[PDB]
Each structure stands twice: as structure tokens, then as C-alpha cells.
Amino acid sequence: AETAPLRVQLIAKTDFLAPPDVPWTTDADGGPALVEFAGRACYQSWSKPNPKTATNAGYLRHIIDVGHFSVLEHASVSFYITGISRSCTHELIRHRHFSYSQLSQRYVPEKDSRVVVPPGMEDDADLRHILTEAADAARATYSELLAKLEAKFADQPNAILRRKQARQAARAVLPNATETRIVVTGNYRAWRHFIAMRASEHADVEIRRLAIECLRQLAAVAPAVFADFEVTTLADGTEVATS
Amino acid sequence: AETAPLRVQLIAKTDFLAPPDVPWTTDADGGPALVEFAGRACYQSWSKPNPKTATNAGYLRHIIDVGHFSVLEHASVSFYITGISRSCTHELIRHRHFSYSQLSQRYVPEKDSRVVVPPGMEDDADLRHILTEAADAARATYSELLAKLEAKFADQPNAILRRKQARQAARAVLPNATETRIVVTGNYRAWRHFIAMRASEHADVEIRRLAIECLRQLAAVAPAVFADFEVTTLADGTEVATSPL
Amino acid sequence: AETAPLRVQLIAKTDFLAPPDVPWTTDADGGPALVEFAGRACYQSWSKPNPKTATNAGYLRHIIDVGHFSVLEHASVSFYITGISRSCTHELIRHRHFSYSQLSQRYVPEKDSRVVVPPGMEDDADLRHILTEAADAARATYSELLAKLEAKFADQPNAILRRKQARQAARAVLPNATETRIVVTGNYRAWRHFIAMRASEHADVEIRRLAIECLRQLAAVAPAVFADFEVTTLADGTEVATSPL
Amino acid sequence: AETAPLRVQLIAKTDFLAPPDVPWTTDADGGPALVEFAGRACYQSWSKPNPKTATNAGYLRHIIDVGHFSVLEHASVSFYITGISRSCTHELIRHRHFSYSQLSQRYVPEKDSRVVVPPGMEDDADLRHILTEAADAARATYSELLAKLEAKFADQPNAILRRKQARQAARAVLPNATETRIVVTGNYRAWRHFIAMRASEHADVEIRRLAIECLRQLAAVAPAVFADFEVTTLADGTEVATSPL
Ligand SMILES: Cc1cc2nc3c(=O)[nH]c(=O)nc-3n(C[C@H](O)[C@H](O)[C@H](O)COP(=O)(O)OP(=O)(O)OC[C@H]3O[C@@H](n4cnc5c(N)ncnc54)[C@H](O)[C@@H]3O)c2cc1C
Ligand SMILES: Cc1cc2nc3c(=O)[nH]c(=O)nc-3n(C[C@H](O)[C@H](O)[C@H](O)COP(=O)(O)OP(=O)(O)OC[C@H]3O[C@@H](n4cnc5c(N)ncnc54)[C@H](O)[C@@H]3O)c2cc1C
Ligand SMILES: Cc1cc2nc3c(=O)[nH]c(=O)nc-3n(C[C@H](O)[C@H](O)[C@H](O)COP(=O)(O)OP(=O)(O)OC[C@H]3O[C@@H](n4cnc5c(N)ncnc54)[C@H](O)[C@@H]3O)c2cc1C
Ligand SMILES: Cc1cc2nc3c(=O)[nH]c(=O)nc-3n(C[C@H](O)[C@H](O)[C@H](O)COP(=O)(O)OP(=O)(O)OC[C@H]3O[C@@H](n4cnc5c(N)ncnc54)[C@H](O)[C@@H]3O)c2cc1C
């Protein structure tokens, strides 16, 4: 078995086009620009009237301070995440205010599928080897089942739909550690709650790792929106994020 | 490996208590009655002038026919589902207007988990034994890894954590076919969409058989809300449920 | 001219049916029994070694304490709220994890529509008078508009269509304070977040007054789920509700 | 009364950034490009075997025909909308898969608020005048209530609170036609749904106009995504937008 490392790639974000017949500007671009525009539209306060918050960064900080998170919802970011385990995405997709598109084992052949090594095993050659040996055996069963199910279903003339009927049964044997790939789209508020929830000590370590990497890259895009999240290291080497 | 048959059990539904100061009654109770009530509340239409919508099934079929699906959201039904695979719940949970509570592999020991047999191999002792032996191996490996991770994490003084730390990693080798158990709650509208999506000929046969089973149980609770669905057989012996709506 | 008092009628709640072959019982039924079952199903733990959590209330307490809110979603309550203003419902409906069925001004005559007096002027009869009379003027204008519209639209031979087309323009003049009526269904979690946002001090007094009323009826049927909330009186003399959770 | 015309301005769309270690490219950018990527990521179908769907538009059209709407959810558009009534936005916020930031009446000066003329009376000077004169009246009655309400709360030292507390009761008398302004964000799936519901013959003409205008600006951004909707005209001379899906 080959192993797959976590890669999170930002592929989409908000293009803000400010409306001309409104008399306002701000030190920000894109999603953070839009969020300010939306909170200000709420009071038609286009003149920067509380000079404390006359910066995008200061305005956004204030919204987070008062708990008016709905304005955060206007801006969105998409990621393409590879090297994520099946079991990890099984936890991820419980978060219902995201949109998702995911590699499907019903359509995509998995005989060369890679595995994602749990973080608890990353530093142990014996454990990793046990895992990959077990994954190799599962892929061989998957190919043995695929071929026999294809024979069994030979009288289905749509070859495509046959393949699928076979594949979806044969994937029965693939382990949780099998690598998946997924596009995840979330608005700032959806992202904040996901990080709050999955970057805590309580969360499984794989999804914690993902959450923290998301925070890292989201903080690059909307520094003010995510500034209250604090990346600490724990007694056991792993990272957590908290507000 | 022991195998697990799908079992869907209705564990909750709506209990409707008509407000007694609304000059209204109908030939039904529960979810179905709430739905007629909510619809009539939109138009304050308590007296029932049209005989075609004078009964509860008549009113509901009209609600469906005219697309007023919002009113269907007030009534719900809960199910406890067992003998469902992990891969199948992994499709189920993509539906975002349901509420879910699920057996966690982080908390529940899986040394002796049952396997769920893909419907396409249910009737074939050979394929089943290939899957069951591969699962037996995967659990054996699971157990090996667990003892080792518990050793590896022995310096974690909270034994509850420790086992959690071990289990959540050991489970890496557990297969898609591993049984899970889940409680799923949806309002009627959520269920209709679930049936439409996952009871079609394009869905995996496992989720599809779940869809059809929930449908048939929901149809017993609320015949008028689900009646537009027709269960129908395929070239290959499997079923679909579809609606012209 | 006729003023509307807040009235809130519990019209629906959860009916629970424990599945037979699961060795667990509890000192509860309905919603709060469902929620315990949901939570236990996660750990497949049906026993009661701990007197803290050996009852429904203590178990529900604990689920709330650790913040496993998901389990609260399985159980629902529906109210029929009459005597709430249009502007108020316009705030209510921003809560997106509720389901709604509302009296439409497009279909229901508003000739004799009642108004809801803002609570910040309930006592001062002077201000009341300036409201009631401003509304009578708006009702008169709506009836004038409706008549002219119906007559303008006389060649729409479909009489229900004419009326709809006429009322939906005529209602332009009806004030914010006009009564509406509305069924609202939320799961225990939705309610908890509503009560928590709209029963605070920072919330408008009319919606606050709805929240606390919802709270007290939710406590009558699911006490442990909502026990952590406390109604206190503010400097104003108006009630608010809070919990440190 | 000033009378505001509907105005819809596209203030946000999606910026797409192809990931360079994926062997794929397409004849498009932004939203439409993200959606294809999301669809192809599902099957890892990066090379493009079929010529019929080898273009961005051919691919998107095929996503719609097959009903895979999940994938439309990755891209969104935000609008700032003015010249929309309160009655209209009160219909609009029934849509729960949208994000809203609306001008508040508890906080913003309604002393000289503009009014929106219902489309049903737009072309009749007699009816418009009735509306705008009822409006003028109403804004007169609102001052009476405001200035007198601040006075009943002289005892409260917090000024900006005191103002808020007086408006919140004073807007009771403001009418449904009163202009509001709102930022509305949704993904392509959510837009399609709004258009299907509110561009229909059954919807109020004011929201219908809004929906057709949004349809127009969305169709420019992402033509393949909105191509199934045709705008036709009913016998009464009002527009509808319908799709066969
Ligand atoms: C200690 C702990 C243990 C847990 N154990 C388990 C377990 O064993 N098994 C299991 O299946 N789950 C368990 N959960 C829940 C699980 O971890 C999921 O992550 C969680 O249910 C999904 O995230 P979320 O609840 O915040 O909902 P999300 O889908 O992420 O929703 C985000 C926000 O939207 C709102 N929302 C979304 N849908 C609804 C709804 N329909 N009704 C009301 N509000 C809604 C909520 O307010 C929520 O804050 C546990 C949670 C905790 C804290
Ligand atoms: C032929 C086909 C192939 C597919 N292939 C794949 C695939 O390979 N990989 C993959 O990941 N998915 C695939 N999908 C989508 C997938 O199968 C899921 O069933 C679907 O994503 C979940 O159901 P739903 O999208 O209707 O969402 P649900 O959550 O069940 O939606 C319920 C309703 O709520 C609304 N809704 C919920 N959330 C939103 C939101 N964020 N924005 C707007 N509306 C919302 C929608 O209108 C929807 O009808 C495919 C779909 C089809 C039809
Ligand atoms: C101090 C303050 C001032 C405000 N001022 C204004 C104003 O001027 N104008 C205005 O229009 N609004 C304003 N709001 C917002 C408004 O008051 C509403 O209460 C709010 O928009 C709706 O309630 P909710 O945010 O709890 O979302 P709800 O619909 O009640 O949903 C509750 C839960 O579901 C989640 N959820 C639902 N949809 C999404 C989504 N798409 N993305 C992520 N999570 C989601 C939320 O995260 C939350 O966890 C203000 C709020 C505050 C606190
Ligand atoms: C002919 C007709 C008459 C109507 N009359 C009235 C009336 O008099 N009074 C009134 O209040 N309403 C009435 N409605 C409903 C109303 O017009 C609103 O537009 C509608 O309630 C909001 O749009 P939506 O229902 O698609 O929900 P949206 O919030 O737009 O949802 C979009 C999608 O998400 C899904 N979704 C969102 N929330 C849930 C949920 N909780 N459960 C399951 N799925 C969900 C749905 O599947 C839906 O397809 C009427 C509708 C029709 C067709």
C-alpha cells in the first residue's frame, strides 16, 4: 500500500464588487470587504461613524465581539482536500452547513487506492506496516470480488452500470483508512464552528489536524475573522485550536 | 463473522393535540392531522367549503399536488436502524435535514462487530464467505493494533481516554461492511426527498433498500403524504420507488 | 380597534416507542425518553451504574453539560401562536432551523384585523389610542384599495385569483402591528437557541415575551431539557431568561 | 412619500483557483469552473473522455439533466437589493438556504422612509396617490409616537438604548410598503430554488419581479447553470420564469 499525506488546497474564495451608488470604501478586499458591507448595510452606516472601527480589521473584530455571526455567512471558501481518510470524512460530513463533493467508491476504481495513516501511528514503523499489509490484503479481496461480481452480473448489457453494480458491492472490503478526496465549501461562520468543534482536545486527531490546517489557510484569507483562534500544542505533541 | 440483517424500527412520531378553540376537526390524528391544521392556518380555512378537500387524505393529496411542501415539515418520524453498513450510513448522512445519532467506533469496542452483506452478494454463499473471511482478518488485525496502541499510549493516565485514543486508530483497518447503528429523525418533507434521491435506480442498492423500507413504514403512518410513491421492480430483481412529483 | 393578546398553544409533541429487543427502560416517555435513547445508542450503553445519570433527568442534564446538543434534535414541539405582530414574526422567521406555516395576507381578509400593542406602551392609554386610530385609518385605506382593485381586476374571471391579486396589493398599507398567526415547529435544540437569543435583554420585548412563554411551555413537557434556563426580572420589570450554557 | 424602484446589484461572486497538481483545464473561470471541478472530482474524471461534455457548458448542462445539484452549491452570488418592500422581504426570508443582512427598523431612521408601490397599482395615479398619502399619514403618526415615546423613557439614562426602545415600539404603525434594503447571498442551487418558487404564476408579483431580475443577473454570470429557465408571459401581462426541472 502507498500512503497519502494530508493536502488542503484552497480553490475558491469571494470576489467582492462594491456597489457604485453607495459612498463607502474600506482597507480590505474580497470576503472580508463583503462582510463589512453587509454589517454596514444593516445600519446604512456608510460614513465610518465610530472611528474605533473605521478599519475592515477593526469592524470585523467588533462583529465577532457582539456575536452577530450571520454577517460572516456572506463570504465563502472552498478547499480540495486529498490524503483524508474515509473515516475522517465520515466525521466531517456531519457538519451540515457545508457543501461537499466527494470521490465515490461506486464509480472510482480503488485497487491502487492509497491509505491514510492515523496520526497515532505515524511515528511507528511496526504499526504502519501492520496497517499497509492489512490494506494490501483488502485491495486484493476487492479485486477478487470485483472480478467475480462482474462475471455474476454479465447479463447486464450496460457495461458501465454492471461495473458500478460490481464495484459498489466489492468496496464492502475497503478499510476506513482508505484515502478519499473531497471538495468542501463553507462560509466563515460554518468554518468557525467546524474549527471550534473539531480542533478541540476532544476531537479525533486526524480531523483535528485537518481543522487546524483549515484554520491556518483561512486565517491567511480573513485574518480578522479567525484571529481569536489560538493554536496551542498539547502534552502529547498534537495541536489544538481554541477561542 | 456474524452477519447483520437490515432492521428499521419506528421509535417516534408526532402526537397532535388540536387546539379546542379552533372551530375545526378532521378524520385523522398525529402527523397527518398537524399537517392539515398548519395548512388551514395559512388561510384561516376552518370550515372546509370544498368537499374534495373535506377529508384529511383529500386535503393532504391537494397539499402535495399543489407543491405546498412546507406544511409537511411540522410532522416527524424517528427510526432506529441496525444492520446498516458504514458505507451506507456514509451516504445517508449526506442528507442535511435529518438529525442523526450514531454508534461511534471511538467509543464502542469493535472486536466482534457484525458485517453487513451487500445486497448484490446476499444470495451467494461464496461471495459472502470471501467478505466474511476478509472481515475476520480485519478484526483480528484491529485487535492486534488495539493492544499495541494501548501499550503505546499507556502513559496516558486516563484509561477512558487511552482506549479512545487506541480505538479511533485501530479502527483504520475496519471495513466498509462493518455494521453500525443509527437513530435517524426527519420531518415528512425530509423523508420524501430522501426517498426520491435514494430509492431511484441510480442509488446503491443498500441505501435504496433502506429508502424503500422507510417509505413503507412512513406510508403506514401517513398514507396520503407518501401515496404518490410507487414501488416498482427492475430487470435485475431489485426495486425502485419513484414519484411523478 | 380590536387588540390582540399573546396566546401560545402547544399543538404537537413527540410520541416515543422504545424498540422491544433493546434492554433499557427509563423514568420518562415522549421526547425526553427519545433523547436519552438517542444518546445511549451512540455508546450502545443501556445500563445504569451511575446514580447521577440513572434517571432521564440526570442523563439529560449530563448530555447538556458536556454539550452533545445533536441528541436534542430528535424531539420536537409545535406551537400555534396567535396575537403576535407582523414585525415580530419578521424577526422570528430569520431563525432558519424552524418550520413555519403563517396566516397569509394574500389569502385572508384583513378588514377586521386586530393589532398587537407593543409592550413598551401597553399601559399608557394615550399612546394606545394613537395606535388604534392610526390602524383604523390603515384598515380603512386597505378596504378602499381592495374595493378599487377588485373592480379594476373584474375581467379576471377566476374569483379566487381576483381576490388574491387585489388583497396582495391592498395589504401594502397595513401596519407592522397587524396581528398574524403562525404554527412553529422546532426540535429541542432549535428552541434552546431561540430561547437563548431572543429571551436575552438585547432582544426586542415582544419577541422576548414570546420566547419566555415558549420556554415555560417547553418546561411543562420536557423539564430536564430546559431546566438550566431561569426566568429573572430586569430593572425594567420585564422578564428575561438565561442559562450559562 | 418618495417611491423607490426595485434595484438589484451584483456585489459578490466566486473566485476560482484551479489546483495546479490536477491534470485538468476548462473553457471558463469563476463559479462555473468551480462547479465542473467539483463534479469531476467525484469521479476523478480529469481527462475528458466524452466530447459532448468536454466544454464547461456541456458539462454543466449534463449536471443539471442528471439532477446532481449538490455540485452547484460550491459557487455563490451576493446581491444588494433596494426598493423592495417589507412585505416582500418578509416573503424572501422564508428561504432558509440564503444568508441575509437586512436594514433594521430598531436602529435606522424611518422618519422619511420611501415606499414601494405594489406592481398591481404601479400604473394607476389614483391608487398610487392613495398609498402614498396613507404612507405620509403613517410617517406623521410615527413621529407623534417616536417623540412621545422618548419622553416616556426620560427616566432611562442610556441614550442610544432609549432611542432604540422608542423606535422598536414606534415602527408598529409603519406599513408593509415601507422600503427596506438587504444583502442576500446564496449558492447556485439555492438561487435555482428561489426562482422556481417565486417566479411562478402562484407567487406575489413583487417577489416575482425580484426573482426574474435575479434570474437575469445570475444567467449572465453562469448561463449554463440557469439556461433551463425561460421567461414567458401570462395572459394578464405579468412575467413568470419556469423550468422543466
Ligand atoms: C461530547 C460529544 C459526543 C458526541 N458523540 C456522538 C456520538 O457518539 N455519535 C454521534 O452520532 N454524534 C455524536 N456527537 C455529535 C457529533 O460529534 C457531530 O459533530 C455533531 O452532531 C455535528 O456538529 P453539530 O452538532 O455542531 O451540527 P452542524 O451540522 O455542524 O451544525 C452547525 C450549527 O447549525 C445548527 N443546526 C444544524 N442542523 C440543525 C438541526 N436540524 N436542528 C437545530 N440546529 C441545527 C446547530 O445550531 C449547529 O450549531 C457528539 C458531540 C459531542 C460534543
Ligand atoms: C447522478 C448523481 C450523482 C451524484 N454523484 C455524487 C458523487 O459522486 N459525490 C458526491 O459527493 N455527491 C454526488 N451526488 C450528490 C449526492 O448523491 C447526495 O445525495 C446529495 O449530495 C445529498 O442529497 P441532496 O444534495 O439533495 O442534499 P440534502 O441535504 O438531502 O438536501 C435536502 C434539500 O435541502 C436543500 N439543501 C440542503 N443544503 C443546501 C445548501 N447548502 N444549499 C442549497 N440547498 C440546500 C436542497 O434543496 C435539498 O433538496 C450525486 C447526485 C446525483 C443525482
Ligand atoms: C447584536 C446583533 C445585531 C444584529 N443586527 C442585525 C441587523 O442589523 N440586520 C440583520 O439582518 N440581522 C442582524 N442580526 C442577525 C439577526 O439578529 C438574527 O438573529 C440572525 O441573523 C438569525 O439567527 P441565527 O444567526 O442564530 O441563525 P439561525 O437561523 O437561528 O440558525 C441557528 C444555528 O444554525 C446555524 N446556521 C444556520 N444557517 C447557517 C448558515 N448558512 N451558515 C452557517 N451556520 C448557519 C448558525 O450557525 C447557528 O449555529 C444581528 C445579530 C446580533 C447578535
Ligand atoms: C401554493 C403554495 C401556497 C403556500 N402558502 C403558504 C402560506 O399561506 N403560508 C406560509 O407560511 N407558507 C406558504 N407556502 C410556503 C411558502 O410560500 C414559502 O416559500 C416556503 O415555505 C419557503 O420556501 P421552501 O418551502 O421551499 O423552503 P426553503 O427554505 O426555500 O428550502 C429550500 C429547500 O431546502 C429544504 N428545506 C429547508 N428547510 C427544510 C426543513 N426544515 N425540512 C426539510 N427540508 C427543508 C427543502 O427541501 C427545500 O426544497 C406556500 C407554498 C405554496 C407552493
XYZ file of C-alpha atoms in Angstrom, chain C residues 4-225:
222
model
C -54.577 41.027 20.143
C -53.176 39.343 23.264
C -50.286 36.816 23.038
C -51.665 33.271 23.128
C -49.410 30.192 22.650
C -50.940 26.715 22.197
C -48.839 23.556 22.304
C -50.294 21.619 19.446
C -47.730 18.808 18.970
C -45.016 16.825 20.655
C -43.058 13.651 20.324
C -44.609 10.233 20.882
C -41.874 7.642 21.813
C -41.968 3.815 21.256
C -38.855 2.059 22.680
C -37.729 -0.738 20.420
C -38.595 -4.118 22.061
C -35.273 -6.029 21.832
C -33.163 -3.348 23.492
C -32.547 -3.842 27.201
C -33.167 -0.387 28.538
C -36.072 1.380 30.227
C -36.241 4.871 31.708
C -38.395 7.048 34.003
C -39.800 9.071 31.124
C -41.532 8.881 27.811
C -42.082 11.120 24.800
C -39.335 13.442 23.664
C -37.146 13.268 26.723
C -37.204 9.451 26.566
C -36.293 9.595 22.838
C -33.314 11.850 23.510
C -31.885 9.557 26.196
C -32.285 6.599 23.864
C -30.567 8.536 21.019
C -27.638 9.303 23.289
C -27.297 5.792 24.631
C -27.397 4.429 21.067
C -24.156 6.288 20.392
C -22.276 4.240 23.042
C -24.505 1.150 22.915
C -24.695 1.587 26.738
C -28.072 0.558 28.122
C -27.163 0.101 31.802
C -27.238 2.405 34.806
C -24.075 2.062 37.032
C -24.149 5.757 37.958
C -26.960 7.157 40.178
C -26.232 10.651 38.782
C -27.353 9.562 35.283
C -29.642 6.559 36.187
C -32.733 8.720 35.646
C -33.890 10.534 32.482
C -33.348 13.937 34.118
C -29.756 13.241 35.240
C -28.858 11.702 31.872
C -30.397 14.682 30.024
C -28.654 17.026 32.451
C -25.305 15.435 31.555
C -25.773 15.413 27.762
C -26.444 19.142 28.100
C -23.474 19.610 30.427
C -20.963 18.079 28.022
C -22.679 19.798 25.056
C -23.814 16.831 22.981
C -26.624 19.012 21.558
C -27.128 16.894 18.497
C -29.120 14.409 20.567
C -31.663 17.111 21.473
C -32.713 17.325 17.745
C -34.663 14.092 17.725
C -37.644 15.570 19.651
C -39.970 18.349 18.501
C -42.633 20.704 19.715
C -45.135 22.708 17.648
C -46.986 25.804 18.857
C -49.894 27.725 17.346
C -49.040 31.335 18.159
C -51.840 33.910 17.715
C -51.581 37.523 18.896
C -48.081 38.246 17.640
C -47.266 41.156 15.397
C -46.114 41.110 11.831
C -42.839 42.894 12.663
C -42.260 40.329 15.434
C -42.814 37.308 13.193
C -40.480 39.087 10.749
C -37.771 38.569 13.347
C -38.938 35.096 14.327
C -38.617 33.750 10.763
C -34.870 34.664 10.496
C -34.326 31.533 12.605
C -33.737 29.026 9.876
C -33.896 25.748 11.796
C -37.587 26.173 12.426
C -40.502 25.231 10.223
C -43.363 27.721 9.694
C -46.910 27.964 8.486
C -48.226 31.565 8.621
C -51.555 33.357 8.046
C -51.093 34.937 4.621
C -52.340 38.445 3.980
C -52.656 37.403 0.346
C -55.482 34.941 1.118
C -57.081 36.063 4.392
C -59.245 39.215 4.637
C -57.702 41.834 6.920
C -60.797 44.114 7.056
C -61.262 43.474 10.763
C -57.653 42.637 11.607
C -56.631 43.051 15.248
C -53.392 44.854 16.151
C -50.727 43.900 18.654
C -49.848 46.718 21.038
C -46.139 46.974 21.655
C -45.430 46.110 25.275
C -43.387 49.325 25.792
C -46.693 51.185 25.560
C -49.188 48.666 26.974
C -50.166 50.881 29.952
C -50.086 54.449 28.593
C -53.659 54.727 27.182
C -52.766 57.884 25.313
C -50.226 56.080 23.045
C -52.535 53.094 22.660
C -55.175 55.480 21.267
C -52.721 56.929 18.714
C -52.023 53.303 17.623
C -55.545 52.020 17.470
C -56.671 55.043 15.479
C -53.723 55.003 13.068
C -54.576 51.345 12.399
C -58.289 52.057 11.826
C -57.120 54.601 9.210
C -54.854 51.929 7.636
C -57.689 49.350 7.729
C -59.998 51.904 6.007
C -57.364 52.541 3.359
C -56.862 48.758 2.784
C -60.641 48.302 2.298
C -60.801 51.254 -0.020
C -57.845 49.876 -2.023
C -59.221 46.360 -2.075
C -62.563 47.526 -3.497
C -60.973 49.581 -6.223
C -58.552 46.744 -7.023
C -61.307 44.101 -7.192
C -63.195 46.318 -9.573
C -60.097 47.110 -11.685
C -59.484 43.345 -11.948
C -63.121 42.418 -12.743
C -62.150 40.751 -16.015
C -60.051 38.146 -14.178
C -62.944 35.656 -14.345
C -61.274 33.493 -11.697
C -62.790 34.899 -8.462
C -60.186 33.438 -6.096
C -57.472 34.799 -8.362
C -59.068 38.328 -8.454
C -59.226 38.405 -4.668
C -55.645 37.264 -4.263
C -54.471 39.820 -6.815
C -56.453 42.506 -5.047
C -55.508 41.698 -1.415
C -51.854 41.287 -2.105
C -51.662 44.887 -3.399
C -54.137 46.227 -0.786
C -52.063 44.913 2.141
C -49.348 47.427 1.240
C -50.967 49.820 3.783
C -51.456 47.502 6.765
C -49.154 48.417 9.622
C -46.329 46.416 11.201
C -48.536 45.969 14.319
C -51.176 43.945 12.491
C -51.907 40.519 14.022
C -50.644 37.425 12.352
C -50.984 33.784 13.290
C -48.444 31.067 12.876
C -47.523 27.430 13.521
C -43.898 26.996 14.553
C -42.179 23.665 14.885
C -38.682 23.348 16.342
C -36.609 20.487 17.686
C -35.401 20.854 21.295
C -32.069 22.216 20.055
C -33.609 24.858 17.767
C -35.814 26.025 20.662
C -32.903 26.151 23.029
C -31.004 28.505 20.676
C -34.056 30.638 20.019
C -34.909 30.949 23.714
C -31.235 31.812 24.338
C -31.003 34.551 21.659
C -34.495 36.045 21.896
C -35.049 35.822 25.678
C -31.977 37.934 26.386
C -32.059 41.620 27.322
C -30.616 42.623 23.950
C -33.841 41.312 22.285
C -36.969 43.349 21.422
C -39.548 42.999 24.222
C -42.335 41.443 22.115
C -40.148 38.609 20.814
C -38.632 38.269 24.313
C -42.108 37.817 25.679
C -42.774 35.093 23.099
C -39.507 33.341 23.947
C -40.175 33.127 27.675
C -43.694 31.946 27.072
C -42.281 29.216 24.787
C -39.759 28.356 27.427
C -42.375 27.871 30.185
C -44.460 25.528 27.989
C -41.399 23.589 26.880
C -40.545 23.096 30.615
C -44.045 21.693 31.310
C -43.376 18.738 28.856
C -39.574 18.342 28.798
C -38.381 19.778 32.203
C -34.879 18.357 32.209
C -34.074 19.537 28.623
